[PDB]
Amino acid sequence: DGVGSSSGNWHCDSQWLGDRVITTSTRTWALPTYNNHLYKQISNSTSGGSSNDNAYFGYSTPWGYFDFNRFHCHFSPRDWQRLINNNWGFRPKRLNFKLFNIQVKEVTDNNGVKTIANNLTSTVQVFTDSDYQLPYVLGSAHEGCLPPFPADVFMIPQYGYLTLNDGSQAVGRSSFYCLEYFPSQMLRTGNNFQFSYEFENVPFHSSYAHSQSLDRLMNPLIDQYLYYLSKTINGSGQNQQTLKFSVAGPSNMAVQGRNYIPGPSYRQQRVSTTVTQNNNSEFAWPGASSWALNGRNSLMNPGPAMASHKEGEDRFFPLSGSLIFGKQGTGRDNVDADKVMITNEEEIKTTNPVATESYGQVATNHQSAQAQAQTGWVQNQGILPGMVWQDRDVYLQGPIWAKIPHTDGNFHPSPLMGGFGMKHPPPQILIKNTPVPADPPTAFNKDKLNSFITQYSTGQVSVEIEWELQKENSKRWNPEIQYTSNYYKSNNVEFAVNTEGVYSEPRPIGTRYLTRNL
Amino acid sequence: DGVGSSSGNWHCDSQWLGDRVITTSTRTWALPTYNNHLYKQISNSTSGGSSNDNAYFGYSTPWGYFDFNRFHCHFSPRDWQRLINNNWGFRPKRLNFKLFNIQVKEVTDNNGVKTIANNLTSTVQVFTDSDYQLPYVLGSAHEGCLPPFPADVFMIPQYGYLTLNDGSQAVGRSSFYCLEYFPSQMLRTGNNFQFSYEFENVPFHSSYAHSQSLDRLMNPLIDQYLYYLSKTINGSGQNQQTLKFSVAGPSNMAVQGRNYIPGPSYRQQRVSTTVTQNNNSEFAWPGASSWALNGRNSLMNPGPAMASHKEGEDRFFPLSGSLIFGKQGTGRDNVDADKVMITNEEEIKTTNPVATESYGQVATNHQSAQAQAQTGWVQNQGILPGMVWQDRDVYLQGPIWAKIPHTDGNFHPSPLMGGFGMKHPPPQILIKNTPVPADPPTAFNKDKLNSFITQYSTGQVSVEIEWELQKENSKRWNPEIQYTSNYYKSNNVEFAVNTEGVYSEPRPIGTRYLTRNL
Amino acid sequence: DGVGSSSGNWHCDSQWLGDRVITTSTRTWALPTYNNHLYKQISNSTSGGSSNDNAYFGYSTPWGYFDFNRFHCHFSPRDWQRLINNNWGFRPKRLNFKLFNIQVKEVTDNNGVKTIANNLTSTVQVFTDSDYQLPYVLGSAHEGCLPPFPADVFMIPQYGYLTLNDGSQAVGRSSFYCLEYFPSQMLRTGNNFQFSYEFENVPFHSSYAHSQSLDRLMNPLIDQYLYYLSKTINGSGQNQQTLKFSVAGPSNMAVQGRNYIPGPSYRQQRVSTTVTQNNNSEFAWPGASSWALNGRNSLMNPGPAMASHKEGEDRFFPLSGSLIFGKQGTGRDNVDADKVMITNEEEIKTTNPVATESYGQVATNHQSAQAQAQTGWVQNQGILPGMVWQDRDVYLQGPIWAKIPHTDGNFHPSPLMGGFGMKHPPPQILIKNTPVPADPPTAFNKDKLNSFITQYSTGQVSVEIEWELQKENSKRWNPEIQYTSNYYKSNNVEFAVNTEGVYSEPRPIGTRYLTRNL
């Protein structure tokens, strides 16, 4: 516990036990000083963006926070391949987190030149919120993750939280949280921090993609003993009416009785990657599927997990349904299509309905000798009984967990975007470097000190997660499809550094390859 | 364990303990040789039936399997009557299965005559799949049950399984299961087989039909303390507008506050058994309620459990909603209505909405001095909170259990057709008689032997299920309605053999007679 | 473990036990920062050098590594003389390695002047790879050794590794190793590092040069009892043919039966140090002995160990066969002959064939009365049975060990260049100084931090090897030849510092002086 001795050792490995995995990831970080050690309110009318649909009121805090909730932080692509090809599912059992080798440096701008010099006295204060008293900002899939590549040094994001608003004004049911009102351990160079966490029991993820469809779960050789209504007409002409019943056999597959039905669907608009096929109109915002809350119009980004392209034609994709990842070096705004990785769910296609297609059809009017039968389309169908659905696939770039909001009720609280929903997720870890005021004036002044010393700190963070596993028991004969690296002579190794040092991931990687029966 | 001594004794009885039942059923079977000891693929393009809506790809195996999942296999009608009149519900606790007295006979066609002769050396191989690794074909309500009547000898169905397909072609996420890759016990005349099974805990079935409706669960003498909005107009003429509130009393029943609402409804078309009332059009396939999955159009055969005829008029029934059983000796195709038993749910009418009628009505446009109120019909309403529904009735011909597909989620996994859904149902029992090749050629040839000896085997199967019971506690005064045999002098005893030996069941038998309060 | 106290003591000595040696060597080092803390790919098309024969694809890492594999690192010339004159062979038993007194300094360029100032907080991270998971770069005889002379301070080389390539493009069977993905101990001023290693059992080196030739291993007084074919002709003239056999005596030495034969030979071109004798053509690359692998043309640098000048005339040497060392202060390119030390193997001349001369001669055509005998030369002869060879001599500048590539097979895995081949050599020791980022921007930015602080570190490395020995038992009468210092008054002491401080080694020193019988 002194300036000389190091406070911890770099540990980065994944040790694979038979029944479980342990992935340590150690990276180095730098924490600037945000908001000049101030709390401020962010409401849009201060930042502009005037509209009823985009309205927010909230506070920005000087505190930073570690967000590791993405997968690629904890898994090298080869640990990922080894994971998803050999296993039918996984769940995190435990979490260990260490923060060490912290060092606090002091910037000085003199006469045009800026000199950086160590500060041995200064402190950087940290706390984990284990009671879930603060707002939970991690689960929203914001950037600021531990970088994919263990070499790169990163910056730590700023913590701020929205609250209630009427337009740009606070209601007064709104809350102000002063983050510095919490019992935060503070530590200097020569001190280290750690805590342990144990994930609450959740269900295993499904890394398997079904090997037989839902609509076709039956013997193709044998008839059922139930009689569908085959033919309601004797023949052409007037007053020809009969009721003719027939066995539901293999010859007519669609009409057999099925005691399970596919999952719910909230329909999405269909956008084609081929450009000339899409309409020549601005349907982006207008034609999108929205859910309104309190007069706001939200957009439906990932939503009930449902297949996208429907089988033959992948030329198109849902307007807002599909997860969309940017490629390395992707611009901020108005990015061309090719520069963006569009995630596509083909593996969920057996269990769940297509995102862009109607759930079904329902009879409307009572038929009569005079009145013909009429059937309308089902655009949305919520949960029914005896309904089976499959959750959205979980990617290497996608979020691990989310916090299930504390409420009187929730149904199947698995996050729409993906991952593992938890009542008590692994806590937020917030960090700030204690302010050191520049020399005050001699005569006592009432006002708070507005002058500080430009300062930042650096260190290493060990994040060790323990993953429980579920291993493939399947007895299928033929070879199983799974994930591989293309062999053709590419200019660069995929998932490897470029010539100029940039790390990049060529395409998203789903979790579902191994197959399993319904 | 020799040719002489028998390997088991016929045991068929139902012994009724107070709190539980044990039903043994022993019957005799004959297992032919399917597919010439070959695996083959069944895809429709080989069998025809060209269309996009009916498409299947799958394999046919030589193996046979025992399917006892229907009730009438295990219950004599008198054990059924005794069951459903005395009890409020039941669940299977355990299962014991024995297969014994197996004998393998060898057919020879010589010079135009066919002679059957014992084969003492031959073997018939059996295995139960307890890990649920194979596809599960039992839960689809295919024929091939143990016959209703313990005397009749039956044939054992062929096992085949569908997989993924794009049209008639396999994807390659498809699986091929080689059934003979499993550790199957094989046994000769003088050997017997058995295993025991324990049903996983499920809910009791409801054999009771409610004694008071959902809409009318209140004191008819006393008013509520809540005020509905009675009258929005002062009187006729312009600018007469008021808000007049009134107590919701017995005088107006429909308007009282009710803290539970009926179960979900997916509307069905209404077909009348009286022929001249139905429309003169082909609405059978076109006007039916369908659920589409992956571009397929399924049909809705049993579906959310909901009443059928609505009260007064039973002259009609749902187009595809109702279970439909064929009478004994019913033709295969285009069967006349009278030859078919149409199952009707009147007992679920209190809890659940009518199949053929709208769930309700919802307001669309905001009213205004200019704009009148407008309300559209609800054709489908999924699960809401505080919603109560009742499951479909379970019949004497209907299936006992079904396998709840292994998936990330399912809601109320009770099978739509009926019975007891189970994550791990009682396993499939597959049987094949080991091939005996006819004399090969003397010189060694590489090719597999395509010539075998026509062969089949015969034996007895004891299926012993233990049923837990729930017994009627009801204190109602008057006599309870229940199931009886008509007394009028019929030509034949119902549920008894004909003159020429044919066994027949006159009408389906529901489980719901005894009444219970909501 | 603090800034004040030193973390280790300089220890440099060689203590000579009778049966073994222990050589400690402590030197001081400086580790810069390579590649701006980046990984980059080195493929030639980025660096040029376009050709099919020179093609490489690989990564450069910021990490440095210690390479001590040369001998002169561990042995003062007087410890070497004492070693090779008194001993018949040696092998390393153990290795101890300590790294201590590490100090990390921070450079700042301000207003044209560069000031160096201590950094007490910073860390330098180290790891030894004991599982041999990374590529092994030590065994290639690259420069960057511990300097010969314990005073000189040196720089630590950069680690980079080639992989598969098709031309300048990566295949995709290629691998990217991220060196920072390993569990590297990190340590500050006041911490030290060490590990111990135990060499796997290998054969003793041969420090002896044989005292009798292979072709002459027999009694010169006594005849053999075997009869060679002396004379096939009766005399001159037609049809004079006889078979005359004779004893193989001392009078004819070459023809006696010898039950061992010399080692294999892969012939080299003969280049004369006297210039006017060599041809007037560019034979350097064209006339060289090459081995092609995968369309590449390698060159044969040290190869099957074989004598060079053949006895009388040393005026010449093999074109590419002989090890070639540069003198101190030798230029980089197109160095004149005299400025370079050309290593010459005269001591292996008894066991092994000459590099520049044919292995032998073989009969081609069957002789006949018509057809004369014809014999071609053997340019290359691989291992035969009953073949004895001697390994290449090992020098004071030459490499100690090499890693025997992990493969299904290898024959006599003693490195062609020299030294001790080992399945598991002493591991690579890699070192990098953890990056400290310059002050980041206040507003959170996604991109990794590209700005760091110019930094390097310094310390001392103790490398302690334990050598097993084999001591001279020879009973020969006369005096044994061995290594000495010329007595003539030279301007400078050989193997000693110059006037201006430069250390230099005048000539290479072989291991073979002491003689031993075959």
Short mmCIF file of N, CA and C in Angstrom, two decimals, chain B residues 29-33 102-108 115-119 122-124 433-434 453-459:
data_model
loop_
_atom_site.label_atom_id
_atom_site.label_comp_id
_atom_site.label_asym_id
_atom_site.label_seq_id
_atom_site.Cartn_x
_atom_site.Cartn_y
_atom_site.Cartn_z
N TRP B 29 -50.69 -57.11 -30.03
CA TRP B 29 -50.28 -56.28 -31.14
C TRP B 29 -49.56 -57.13 -32.17
N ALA B 30 -49.40 -56.57 -33.36
CA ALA B 30 -48.64 -57.22 -34.42
C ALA B 30 -47.84 -56.17 -35.15
N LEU B 31 -46.55 -56.41 -35.32
CA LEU B 31 -45.64 -55.41 -35.88
C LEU B 31 -45.10 -55.87 -37.22
N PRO B 32 -45.54 -55.32 -38.33
CA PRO B 32 -45.02 -55.74 -39.63
C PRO B 32 -43.62 -55.22 -39.86
N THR B 33 -43.11 -55.35 -41.08
CA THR B 33 -41.80 -54.83 -41.45
C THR B 33 -42.00 -53.72 -42.47
N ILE B 102 -43.53 -62.12 -26.39
CA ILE B 102 -43.21 -61.76 -27.77
C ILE B 102 -42.87 -63.00 -28.57
N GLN B 103 -43.39 -63.08 -29.78
CA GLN B 103 -43.15 -64.22 -30.64
C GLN B 103 -43.03 -63.77 -32.08
N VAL B 104 -42.05 -64.32 -32.78
CA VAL B 104 -41.60 -63.79 -34.06
C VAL B 104 -41.81 -64.84 -35.12
N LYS B 105 -42.67 -64.56 -36.09
CA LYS B 105 -43.06 -65.55 -37.07
C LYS B 105 -42.58 -65.17 -38.45
N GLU B 106 -42.39 -66.19 -39.29
CA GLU B 106 -41.65 -66.09 -40.54
C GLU B 106 -42.54 -66.56 -41.68
N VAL B 107 -42.85 -65.67 -42.59
CA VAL B 107 -43.74 -65.98 -43.71
C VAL B 107 -42.91 -66.46 -44.89
N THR B 108 -43.43 -67.45 -45.62
CA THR B 108 -42.78 -67.95 -46.82
C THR B 108 -43.83 -68.12 -47.90
N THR B 115 -47.17 -69.89 -46.44
CA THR B 115 -47.16 -70.65 -45.20
C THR B 115 -46.43 -69.86 -44.12
N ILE B 116 -47.03 -69.78 -42.94
CA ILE B 116 -46.46 -69.08 -41.80
C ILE B 116 -45.90 -70.12 -40.84
N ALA B 117 -44.69 -69.88 -40.34
CA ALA B 117 -44.03 -70.83 -39.47
C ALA B 117 -43.20 -70.08 -38.44
N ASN B 118 -43.17 -70.60 -37.22
CA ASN B 118 -42.48 -69.93 -36.13
C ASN B 118 -41.01 -69.75 -36.46
N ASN B 119 -40.42 -68.73 -35.86
CA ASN B 119 -38.98 -68.52 -35.91
C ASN B 119 -38.52 -68.33 -34.47
N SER B 122 -35.16 -65.58 -33.90
CA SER B 122 -35.21 -64.17 -34.28
C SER B 122 -35.46 -63.27 -33.07
N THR B 123 -35.16 -61.99 -33.26
CA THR B 123 -35.18 -61.02 -32.19
C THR B 123 -36.00 -59.81 -32.63
N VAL B 124 -36.64 -59.17 -31.66
CA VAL B 124 -37.35 -57.91 -31.88
C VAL B 124 -36.80 -56.90 -30.90
N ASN B 433 -38.27 -55.33 -35.56
CA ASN B 433 -37.81 -56.70 -35.55
C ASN B 433 -36.56 -56.84 -36.40
N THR B 434 -35.47 -57.26 -35.76
CA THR B 434 -34.16 -57.26 -36.38
C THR B 434 -34.19 -57.99 -37.72
N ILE B 453 -36.08 -61.70 -45.16
CA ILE B 453 -37.09 -62.73 -44.98
C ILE B 453 -38.33 -62.07 -44.40
N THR B 454 -39.47 -62.24 -45.08
CA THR B 454 -40.70 -61.61 -44.62
C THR B 454 -41.04 -62.09 -43.22
N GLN B 455 -41.24 -61.15 -42.31
CA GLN B 455 -41.23 -61.48 -40.90
C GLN B 455 -42.04 -60.46 -40.12
N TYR B 456 -42.66 -60.91 -39.04
CA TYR B 456 -43.41 -60.03 -38.15
C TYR B 456 -43.44 -60.69 -36.78
N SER B 457 -43.86 -59.93 -35.78
CA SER B 457 -43.91 -60.45 -34.43
C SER B 457 -45.16 -59.98 -33.71
N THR B 458 -45.44 -60.62 -32.57
CA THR B 458 -46.70 -60.47 -31.86
C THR B 458 -46.44 -60.64 -30.37
N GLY B 459 -47.27 -60.02 -29.55
CA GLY B 459 -47.05 -60.06 -28.12
C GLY B 459 -48.15 -59.33 -27.38
#
